[PDB]
Symmetry: D2
Subunit: 332 residues, 4 copies
Amino acid sequence: MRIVINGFGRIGRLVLRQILKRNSPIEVVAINDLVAGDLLTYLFKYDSTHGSFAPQATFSDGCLVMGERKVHFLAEKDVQKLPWKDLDVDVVVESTGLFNRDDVAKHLDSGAKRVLITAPAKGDVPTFVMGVNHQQFDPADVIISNASCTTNCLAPLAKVLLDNFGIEEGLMTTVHAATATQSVVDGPSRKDWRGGRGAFQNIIPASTGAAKAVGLCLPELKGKLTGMAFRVPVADVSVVDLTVKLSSATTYEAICEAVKHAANTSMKNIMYYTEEAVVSSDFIGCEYSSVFDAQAGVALNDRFFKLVAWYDNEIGYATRIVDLLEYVQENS
Amino acid sequence: MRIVINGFGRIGRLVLRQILKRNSPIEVVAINDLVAGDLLTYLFKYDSTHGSFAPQATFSDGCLVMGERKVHFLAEKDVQKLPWKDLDVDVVVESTGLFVNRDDVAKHLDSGAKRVLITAPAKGDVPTFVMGVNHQQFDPADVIISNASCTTNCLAPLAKVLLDNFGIEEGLMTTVHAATATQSVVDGPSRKDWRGGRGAFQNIIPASTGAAKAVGLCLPELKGKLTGMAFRVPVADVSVVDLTVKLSSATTYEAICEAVKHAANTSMKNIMYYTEEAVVSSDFIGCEYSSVFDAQAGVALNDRFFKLVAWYDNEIGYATRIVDLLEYVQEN
Amino acid sequence: MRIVINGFGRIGRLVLRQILKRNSPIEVVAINDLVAGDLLTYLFKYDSTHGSFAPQATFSDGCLVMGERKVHFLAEKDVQKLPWKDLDVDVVVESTGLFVNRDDVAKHLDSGAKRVLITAPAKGDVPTFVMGVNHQQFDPADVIISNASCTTNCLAPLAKVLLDNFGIEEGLMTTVHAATATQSVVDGPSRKDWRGGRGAFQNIIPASTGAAKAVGLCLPELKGKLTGMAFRVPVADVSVVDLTVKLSSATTYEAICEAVKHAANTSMKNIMYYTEEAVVSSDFIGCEYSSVFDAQAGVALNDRFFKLVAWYDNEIGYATRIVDLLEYVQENS
Amino acid sequence: MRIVINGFGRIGRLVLRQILKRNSPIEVVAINDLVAGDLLTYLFKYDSTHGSFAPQATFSDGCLVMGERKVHFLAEKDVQKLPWKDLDVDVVVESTGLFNRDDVAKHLDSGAKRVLITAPAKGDVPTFVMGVNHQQFDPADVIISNASCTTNCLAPLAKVLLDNFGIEEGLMTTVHAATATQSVVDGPSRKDWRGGRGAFQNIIPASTGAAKAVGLCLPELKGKLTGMAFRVPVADVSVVDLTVKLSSATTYEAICEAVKHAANTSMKNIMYYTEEAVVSSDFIGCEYSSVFDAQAGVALNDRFFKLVAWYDNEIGYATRIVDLLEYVQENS
Ligand SMILES: NC(=O)c1ccc[n+]([C@@H]2O[C@H](COP(=O)([O-])OP(=O)(O)OC[C@H]3O[C@@H](n4cnc5c(N)ncnc54)[C@H](O)[C@@H]3O)[C@@H](O)[C@H]2O)c1
Ligand SMILES: NC(=O)c1ccc[n+]([C@@H]2O[C@H](COP(=O)([O-])OP(=O)(O)OC[C@H]3O[C@@H](n4cnc5c(N)ncnc54)[C@H](O)[C@@H]3O)[C@@H](O)[C@H]2O)c1
Ligand SMILES: NC(=O)c1ccc[n+]([C@@H]2O[C@H](COP(=O)([O-])OP(=O)(O)OC[C@H]3O[C@@H](n4cnc5c(N)ncnc54)[C@H](O)[C@@H]3O)[C@@H](O)[C@H]2O)c1
Ligand SMILES: NC(=O)c1ccc[n+]([C@@H]2O[C@H](COP(=O)([O-])OP(=O)(O)OC[C@H]3O[C@@H](n4cnc5c(N)ncnc54)[C@H](O)[C@@H]3O)[C@@H](O)[C@H]2O)c1
């Protein structure tokens, strides 16, 4: 399967890293960004969060050269000018953070067969969470979304609670790492005024559609969940704080056992269960979607609980992108 | 009213700052800590969070000199050796963080102080007050009192407004809390709190808090109805309460906003503030309110289930409440 | 004097703040940026570093309204379309960080402005001024001028005191500098500075600076005698100069302290400050001085070779100097 | 060789990590700190800076158990009560940061044969830097020092300059990561007032004896070097900025070639030479003492230069401790 990465940022670079880590048969034909391949190769090899990678990788003849892989570098900001027809592209990984279905469809017009958006999409874009609803993928879905990092953390936990106890209502907060949409010092973010305030000086409230998105991947939870975010001064790793009213009376220990059991069966490689005294840095490089923190959660009574689940919003999400690409390869 | 400050830390120093920032009968006659007065004077005058103060203040001859006002400096770790009888002390502000058991705190009375105000939740049933919530329940016979935690001072006023207007069925609270002096610059041991020893500015750190249960002490109707947890994050000051609450009556988010706005204008004047501004944590550095309701940040799931957001300067808001409680309790 | 602020960023907003703080008779007639006036008003009123300001300021009818000041908001990226003729502009404060070549900056004059003050070092034939060092060399014929960098404003006053008292043979400067808007929250591309894109709050980041060479422009006797470098570190504001200097005459560290203390009381009043306190960077947030000499931090190897330490609020110190230079130009044009 | 680690902090734990990483024949028989082995095991396994280690490690039977290694845990604050005679201790790694030769000699009185202090020492304590003067070690040296992280970075570079060009005079600044002697929020540090100011809110000047200490390992540089430090908000990795007047005329390129040559020959495994666009995070886990940054340095003229060298103050220094222990093992 021939892919290109459009936007070689945190997610674009770490998707390529996770492809190389599993020796994937996925063929990465090109990388597109706003700068030249020499700088993009440097950013791929040296990572402040995830450490150095691909020490033998070089920029040569306008390509990223790594073993038998030679990946063409492009620097074309306009999707209508991208040479996807000439490069016989099966899937565009759309990871610029700029691109509505109508904007993303320009990749198809430029000759790509499919687009995978590394973010929530607006319009008639099927949204998938590996281990929750990815088997709903149909080859007729030419533009798909892998949802947000937050939805990938919440949806597996919500599915376990739905299947074991039922959910009456849930309100979610994510305490989220700073990301590339934020600023080093106070500046303008036109769609999110708070989001422009200095990232490492502030706790910053933010909107998230993650809780509503769980209602699309698990229709039984439509209208039953909403939530919000706080952006805080860490460079990576985020946590979901789910306050949930269950349909059946249970114990905190029974919830722990249900999540532990799911991690060992239906949610293998998606959910992990820990009882260790973890902090955010313990999840840097963690490939799971959702790590249930058994010690951190609290119970008010037999139906009302606050549950805690960690996610590496960079590497966990990047690993899910590669999982979804490999699933689409096998089912298209 | 003659007071002494035992423990000249974040809270001890900012209590003195807030005394000097108002017209007050309070006479600060002595300060006790573990180091000499020259270093304590330096820390009072230069503050990384709250900026410089009292530029004309000097250390001379074992006293803090501010015009003709002279405060004795002591460096005596043992409460049984403190000269409270000789200094005719009306109230000890107990802000070391070491002495919260009645038996430990009573040693101040044995040493000659008439009353002790603990700047923290107490262990045992020490009368606990939140200004604007239950401070009028103070009795002159109460010789050892607590001003609760910063978090309880943020949550309790909001909980009182909800209780009085709508009723509360159940609530689960998270505080996203600034790093404090109990934390470590790099990973080290914290025997009662393993996570709390992990590098403070590298991590989101879960913590246990009794703040939601403590609301049950000031508002008996809410005993058994609230609990919660904390995440410590890399900001040096300002914290936020995220209250997920099931109310006893059907209402709207707008009705909650109106009730809080009304309370801030009347019964909670100078305790609660109501904002619709695009606020972030740094906007509350130096804020003297106990609880600042963030109208834009909150979400409603339905007519009974809400997630409400309230900010607090855990240093200056709390220090201001200590001075308010001193002025309320003491005879003049 | 009618001014406009082109680029309402850290420097643009704090220039307006410092104008209002001294109740300056300077008239700010317009602000240009890339975003709407309601968001720019919000950023002016709420500042993570310097606290809230102008609580009664409002966005109304495409203007910033503050008492009798009514400032037009523009959102025009192209200097050739800016209405400087219609607004009768005396000085453009050029604070976008995009326009530092004389040819780019001259488009402001073509659009009707009488003068441009670039809030950065300039390329080409642009007279560069440091208040208290060479600002009296300003000539009314200078239609495009530079206020140099924050770093040059910190180093040049100290270099002048050393030059005048002892002479300088050679010097090498490091600035340990706060993170700025050119940096990124997480690793990203900076095409002209690869290191400068690496996560700002995860890294000590080496950077190039022309500040030491620029001192040779304001003090020609020091041409070829200074160079230096920077490290960007995870603080949101306040920077420090570390000057390693070989002096022309033998002295003591205490004689250097006395010369700086004397200068701060006389020739460098309101430009240099002298401290012996145990200061740290946060102590200078909101400090309006160009250069604060840290007497306790410095070291002497011998009677000619010294390491001297001087602090600067790279935001507020520099913004205050912009207002001082505007007021000087007003009085001398 | 039977060793114990006294003070299981950043250096103590990472010394054990580096022993295990090279499968050293050094036998670690005991670890002493102020808290129990369950918490010390947790801190060994989970590291905010260097990531997780020894997943199979357990606290079991009062020991740290890792394969065939079983390390006894102690919690004795008083060196005079440590059971070094009973444990047949060949070398104490003294890494508490509390312990003059007379104070350190109490380890010998308690039954240890030798002490290696992980810091500069006062009194008649031979001080060694691997690759500079470690071959001056004599088995008769019962108390030895591995100097500071900063001295281990500067001394190898200074030796290359001395041998190739000669040094007239040098003034050094280290821009240094925050360390455990610092505070999360403003507090008192009696011998270092600035060092008590909030570590992640400030650039903090400090004194360092590192430049003078180079005069101990390279006597020809006595009286020719001094310097200072700035502590900054990073959790690890530091940089030396050496302003040096050389005894002979040269070029920046000739300095680069001399350091490159040394890194390939006499300074193999001690110095590294890079021309990459490096930043501090690129050296997290770097085992070199001194990494010369060719691109960062500047020349004023043919005798006056500013040279830049990086060091992982935790892992580089810890690796040198293990190198010095193995050198002592081979030469005693
Ligand atoms: N970072 C995370 O935690 C995270 C998690 C899940 C999903 N996502 C989503 O993934 C996307 C990328 O996020 P990111 O964090 O990698 O951002 P980023 O800013 O690191 O990466 C975006 C990249 O796209 C490039 N780019 C910008 N405009 C372009 C254009 N016209 N053509 C080509 N390249 C262009 C940028 O130069 C940059 O390298 C966003 O939609 C984001 O919401 C991010
Ligand atoms: N920081 C906040 O946000 C906050 C808010 C509300 C309540 N509190 C409570 O206030 C108390 C103080 O907290 P802080 O943040 O100011 O801590 P801190 O560590 O800044 O201050 C404690 C001070 O007490 C001194 N001290 C220690 N032992 C002493 C002794 N035996 N005798 C005299 N002085 C001694 C220390 O040297 C230090 O200066 C704690 O109980 C804390 O829970 C803190
Ligand atoms: N920040 C400091 O410490 C400091 C100190 C001295 C000098 N400077 C210099 O001042 C200048 C501004 O720096 P800053 O830190 O304020 O940066 P900034 O990024 O905070 O501000 C720049 C502003 O210009 C706006 N802008 C960008 N392109 C524009 C265009 N075409 N038209 C109009 N507005 C546009 C941006 O939206 C932003 O609001 C730079 O030249 C910088 O080197 C900065
Ligand atoms: N961190 C570095 O960058 C670095 C580099 C080189 C050398 N050093 C030196 O190494 C030493 C340790 O530094 P660190 O950074 O590991 O500090 P640290 O605070 O992380 O470690 C010290 C440890 O000693 C323990 N301890 C304290 N008093 C004790 C006692 N009486 N008995 C037993 N254990 C006790 C503490 O609980 C802690 O775990 C210091 O001398 C320091 O100067 C540190």
